[PDB]
Amino acid sequence: NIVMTQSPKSMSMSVGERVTLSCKASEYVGTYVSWYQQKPEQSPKLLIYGASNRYTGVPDRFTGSGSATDFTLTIGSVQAEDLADYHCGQSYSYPTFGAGTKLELK
Template identity: 55%
Template sequence: MSLLLWVSGICGDIMLTQSPSSVAVSEGEKVSINCKASQNLFGSNSKKNRLAWYQQKAGQSPKLLIYWGSTRHTGVPDRFVGTGSETDFTLTISSVQAEDMGDYYCLQDHTSPPTVLQPPTKTSSENLTSCSHYTQTWTCTLPSSA
């Protein structure tokens, strides 16, 4: 069984570049998604990396997976691991499950508001067609640093 995860970038005052742009994996395999920021995301006041990872499944709102670069949100399975600091971050799914298929975003909240570059439109999980992009501002709430 093959799964396709689409990885999208985010732009704003701080540019985030994700790679790879898409990845096809089999259930049970490990997959890593990288996110590189154009500026340091370590907050001098909060003493936290201001980087979050979101998952979005078709027809659903984005779901927070990881905040502060490496802290799993409540209820997120431990197969999702965030690592990295300052400008280089990675989301690793240690054993991909069928329910993990979807779009994954890294999002910075070091500057506000974050602006999201939406993923390309795809017709199926195995056939990517021509892409259309548009920007949309999301309001995202992360736990306070207090």
């Protein structure tokens, strides 16, 4: 089992500032790391597939960066419709997900 550690657990930030979410892999997972956005009472929505490949319909402000074991999701000009849980999941092996990051407005 590959356990993925997501940090920070929760971070409250203001509009229009660069916010970066980090994911750490227990073992090697080449670039099969995905980032999903889950709004309250909504199913997860795929944002980044592979490492640094925006999914169709994802605004160009969502940027993914990856490595063999260290990955980051970078949001640029943040907006107010980005308040959602963000999960990172690996797919190199049988899929596992991180705890997630609860974005907050402040």
